[PDB]
From a paper:
Binding of the SARS-CoV-2 spike protein to the human ACE-2 receptor at the cell surface is the first step in viral entry and blocking this interaction correlates with neutralization of infection. Structural analyses have mapped out the epitopes of these nanobodies on the RBD and have shown that the majority cluster in two regions: one on the side of the RBD, distal from the human angiotensin converting enzyme-2 (ACE-2) receptor binding interface (cluster 1), while the second are close to or at the ACE-2 binding region (cluster 2).
The monomeric nanobodies were each mixed with a hexaPro stabilized version of the BA.1 spike protein trimer in a 3.6:1 molar ratio and then vitrified on cryo-EM grids. By contrast, H6 formed a complex with the BA.1 spike trimer and an approximately equal mixture of the two forms was observed on the grids. H6 is only able to bind the spike trimer in the ‘up’ conformation, with the epitope partly inaccessible when the RBD is ‘down’. H6 binds directly at the ACE-2 receptor–RBD interface and completely occludes the site of ACE-2 binding and corresponds to Cluster 2(21) nanobodies. The H6 trimer inhibited ACE-2 binding to the spike protein across all the strains tested, including eight variants of the Omicron SARS-CoV-2 virus.
Author numbering:
A (entry chain C): 626 to 673, 686 to 722
B (entry chain A): 723 to 838, 845 to 1061
C (entry chain C): 917 to 1144
The structure:
């Protein structure tokens, strides 16, 4: 169906996902912030020359609390924040 | 137990109503755009489900980790923290809940290659399922990060930077927050730890037992399945026509009245689709309201200590623990 | 006071820059208007549908058809358009329901953040709520939440209790911290060390039931100087 939709050739590798088959985007192992949500944790964005790339979403920045059996952290400063809603 | 999201579905009117019939496509074209509203509504519903999941679960900007040593003032959280000895980094209680909920799900299958039989056979009838944006191992990672933050930092990580604190010290200050002096904990720590361990084990026994209390999550799945089954069975309705098959109508009838015969069939099936869409939107609204309540409960019981009566459990609230469930969430108060 | 006023002024100016910026975050108010306009437009456009009839014009269908079948042709068009109106009304009610829910939430938030101070976490802004300000918007309302966010933390040494004379001492409304050699008492939300005296602690029990007690001294502010 839609015979005109040849979608050129396999210039960009076809990436197979659980949602389906995506043609026209190149998979990368780098994790970036989501731009266009494809689904199942995969998002696509326009970046660097310039092309459309597909990747795996990152939950957030890693952290590790320095826990100890005698230790506490107390602030020495404060910040006043104004937010909209 | 609180529902969070539901299944994302898409329906193709042209193929569902008139499967492989060009004459039907030309005749449906005279009705204008009778399918954009349904497609737009379904896309909005799917986006709403994804947004609901993101608001409920994505509340921390950092992925905290627990120290390798699992000694917290004598308390044992080994039955709720994930273990790396499984492909799914899930707690034993999480595994029990998923095993209990999995009698029916969407199938887990979305490649469509292995379909040679309820979903993919309905796939030939324009009922597909879109995958959730967050997989269960990312929802699990979110829950594990939230649990780690709560055990280590307490309520400090929910309003800025995570601040470390000994676990007995956080319990003593939390007790002081409800009108009980901290010497009570410092003198009955062993008894309190024993009671907590026994209570957790009884939680495991309660869930592992037969009287499944997870009816709220099962009701949504059952309703969706039954609605889809009714819609697919509705294709057999005659709607006043001599027959329910378009090919048969074209072969056995001349155009002059075949036009109205199919117009009647189109009207009946379009009415069925609009009714189904209305039912889906109403259920989407109730599920979204439930999601909003769940979000309020997470933010007010998990991220802090609540003074509201009978809001986070029954009695005098101390803390709550989140666990992930299929299209839902489970709290331990 | 001066620093806090400067921070508040800077935060308000940044709020102006955020709103005046091109990436408008006011999509919630625009979504409702867009949805209503699109629904109304499709309702208007639905008039041109033939509904399977011979023609969509009443005058043409009346002049070019006999009454025996013109009646049912008009009845078909009437039924189709009535179905369209009932549908439109249904989505109008569902949207009104959602609007009412949002309005109820907004009213509760205004009454609980603007008219008072809220202890509910992540309800009136993000952080520790101080006050909120309402602003009027077309078919909506905008809140400006002022919160308190700690910063510049420092590590210390801490104890649950301090043993002085075979007695356990506990803080009144503070924590026990130590910069090393010495021990001080400070509030738990801001660093303000103080000497641990009998007016900063209360005595309960002995020095063999609390895990982690530390030997130290508690100063008596009455006997040494007012010994006359
Ligand atoms: C928090 O830290 C900031 C930056 O170190 C302090 O701001 C400085 O304050 C001093 C005196 O008030 C000024 O001379 C500097 O010009 C300020 N610099 C900046 C970058 O703001 C602030 O006073 C601290 N707040 C506390 C300790 O409560
Ligand atoms: C907390 O106490 C339990 C006692 O049952 C310790 O043993 C765990 O028991 C559960 C339930 O049978 C098992 O699923 C775990 O595998 C057991 N843990 C281990 C290490 O064998 C548990 O270890 C204790 N947790 C602590 C001390 O953190
Ligand atoms: C913690 O800070 C206090 C205050 O600076 C230190 O207490 C001593 O206080 C006397 C009284 O003025 C000073 O003459 C000493 O110089 C202070 N000691 C030091 C090392 O500065 C206390 O010693 C500090 N504790 C540490 C650094 O472990
Ligand atoms: C505070 O001083 C007492 C002084 O007795 C310490 O008590 C220890 O234990 C018994 C007495 O209960 C005796 O052996 C000694 O008097 C002490 N030393 C040892 C090695 O036992 C007590 O341990 C001190 N507290 C802290 C936190 O050091
Ligand atoms: C606290 O002390 C206990 C005592 O053995 C130890 O098991 C645990 O690892 C310690 N926790 C720390 C140092 O964070
Ligand atoms: C305490 O030291 C640890 C060292 O890993 C650091 O991560 C933490 O930020 C420090 N907390 C302070 C300085 O309040």
């Amino acid at each position: 169906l839609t015979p005109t939709w040849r979608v050129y050739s396999t210039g960009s590798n076809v990436f197979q996902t659980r949602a389906g088959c995506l043609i026209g985007a190149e998979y990368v192992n780098n994790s970036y912030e989501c731009d266009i949500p494809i689904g199942a944790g995969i998002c696509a964005s326009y970046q660097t020359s310039q092309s459309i790339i597909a990747y795996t979403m990152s939950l957030g920045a890693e952290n590790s609390v320095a826990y100890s059996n005698n230790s506490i952290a107390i602030p020495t400063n404060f910040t006043i924040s104004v937010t909209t809603e | 137990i609180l529902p969070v999201s539901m299944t994302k579905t898409s329906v193709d009117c042209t193929m569902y109503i008139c499967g492989d019939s060009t004459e039907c496509s030309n005749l449906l074209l005279q009705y204008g755009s009778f399918c954009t509203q349904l497609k737009r509504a379904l896309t909005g519903i799917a986006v709403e489900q994804d947004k609901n999941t993101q608001e409920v679960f994505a509340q921390v900007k950092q992925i905290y980790k627990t120290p390798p040593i699992k000694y917290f003032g004598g308390f044992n959280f080994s039955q709720i923290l994930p273990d790396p000895s499984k492909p799914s980094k899930r707690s034993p209680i999480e595994d029990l809940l998923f095993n209990k909920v999995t009698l029916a799900d969407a199938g887990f299958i979305k490649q469509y290659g292995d379909c040679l039989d309820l979903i993919c056979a309905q796939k030939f009838k324009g009922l597909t399922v879109l995958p959730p944006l967050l997989t269960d191992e990312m929802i699990a990672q979110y829950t594990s990060a939230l649990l780690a933050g709560t055990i280590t930092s307490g309520w400090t990580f929910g309003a800025g930077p995570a601040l470390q604190i000994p676990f007995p010290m956080q319990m003593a200050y939390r007790f002081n927050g409800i009108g009980v002096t901290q010497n009570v904990l410092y003198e009955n720590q062993k008894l309190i730890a024993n009671q907590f361990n026994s209570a957790i084990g009884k939680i495991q026994d309660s869930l592992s037992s037969t009287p499944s209390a997870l009816g709220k999550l099962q009701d949504v799945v059952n309703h969706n399945a039954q609605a889809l089954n009714t819609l697919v069975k509705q294709l057999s309705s005659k709607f006043g026509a001599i027959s329910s098959v378009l090919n048969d109508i074209f072969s056995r009838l001349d155009p002059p009245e075949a036009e109205v015969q199919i117009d009647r069939l189109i009207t009946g099936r379009l009415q069925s689709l609009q009714t189904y869409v209305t039912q889906q939107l109403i259920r989407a609204a109730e599920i979204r309201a439930s999601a909003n309540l769940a979000a309020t409960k997470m933010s007010e019981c998990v991220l802090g200590q609540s003074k509201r009566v009978d809001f986070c459990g029954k009695g005098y609230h101390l803390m709550s623990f989140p666990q992930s469930a299929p299209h839902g969430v489970v709290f331990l108060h | 006071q001066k620093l806090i006023a400067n921070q508040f002024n800077s935060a308000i100016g940044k709020i102006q820059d955020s709103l005046s910026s091109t990436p408008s975050a006011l999509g919630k108010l625009q979504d409702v208007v867009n949805h209503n306009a699109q629904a109304l437009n499709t309702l208007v456009k639905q008039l041109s549908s033939k509904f399977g009839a011979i023609s969509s014009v009443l005058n043409d269908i009346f002049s070019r058809l006999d009454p025996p079948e013109a009646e049912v042709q008009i009845d078909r068009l009437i039924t189709g358009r009535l179905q369209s109106l009932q549908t439109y009304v249904t989505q109008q009610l569902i949207r009104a329901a959602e609007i009412r829910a949002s309005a109820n939430l907004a009213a509760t938030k205004m009454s609980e953040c603007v008219l008072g101070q809220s202890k509910r976490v992540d309800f009136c802004g993000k952080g520790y709520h101080l006050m909120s300000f309402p602003q009027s918007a077309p078919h909506g309302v905008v809140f400006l939440h002022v919160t308190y966010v700690p910063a510049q933390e420092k590590n210390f040494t801490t104890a649950p209790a301090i043993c002085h004379d075979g007695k356990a001492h506990f803080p009144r409304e503070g924590v026990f911290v130590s910069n090393g050699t010495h021990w001080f008492v400070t509030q738990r939300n801001f660093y303000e060390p103080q000497i641990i005296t009998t007016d900063n602690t209360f005595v309960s029990g002995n020095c063999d039931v609390v895990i982690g007690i530390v030997n130290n001294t508690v100063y008596d502010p009455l006997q040494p100087e007012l010994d006359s």
